[PDB]
Design a protein around this ligand. Structure first.
Ligand code: ZN
Length: 209
């Protein structure tokens, strides 16, 4: 029954209008979010609510297991629009514990199309197989891989020519990695923030255009 959503929407918009009748009118005149959220599609990880933001505050991309690929124009176009046009100051790469996408990457069932999408996470599980082997439970392995994934995705974002060129031209921009706890509602910093070219390995740095 869709009717509940439509009715919910009317109630929400009208309620807002009575507290501030110009709320949407002002918002609609320009888009000026300071943040881009790159997160998982998981229904339990809604960006605005988790960090207490309002409409207008967060440009958002969400996909299964918050994966950022350098050949993916879907995610890359959100990043490029955020960085080059909206000039967001921060990119929030937020993964979450108990991520089904990450979990799937540790198991050997075929899920179909998504098998290809999760390849880079499967690669990570292989790269860190020694580390993950020393963890006794499946849940610990999944949760650690969730962290490792966020840290990798922060690297993937920072290595884009989109981000590096923003830096080359003196634009202020930081990429952060955070992880959300679906079990406790807490959004935690993984402390892997990148804010400049000097923090990149030489093998990944691009010369200015
Ligand atoms: Zn997820």
């Amino acid at each position: 029954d869709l009717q509940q959503l439509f009715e919910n929407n009317v109630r929400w918009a009208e309620a807002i209008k009575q507290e501030d009748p110009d709320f949407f009118a002002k918002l609609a005149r320009q888009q000026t979010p300071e943040y881009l959220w790159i997160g998982c599609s998981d229904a339990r990880v809604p960006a605005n609510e988790i960090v207490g933001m309002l409409p207008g505050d967060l440009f958002v991309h969400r996909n299964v297991a918050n994966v950022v690929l350098h050949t993916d124009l879907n995610c890359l176009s959100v990043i490029q629009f955020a960085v080059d046009v909206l000039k967001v100051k921060h990119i929030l790469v937020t993964g979450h514990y108990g991520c089904g996408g990450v979990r799937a990457s540790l198991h050997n069932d075929q899920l179909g199309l998504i098998d290809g999408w999760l390849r880079s996470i499967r690669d990570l599980a292989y790269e860190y197989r020694e580390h993950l082997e020393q963890l006794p439970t499946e849940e610990e392995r999944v949760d650690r891989l969730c962290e490792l994934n966020v840290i990798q995705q922060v690297a993937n974002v920072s290595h884009t020519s989109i981000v590096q060129n923003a830096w080359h031209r003196g634009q202020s921009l930081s990429v952060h990695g955070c992880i959300y706890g679906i079990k406790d509602g807490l959004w935690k910093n993984l402390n892997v923030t990148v804010s400049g070219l000097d923090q990149l390995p030489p093998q990944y740095r691009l010369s200015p255009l």
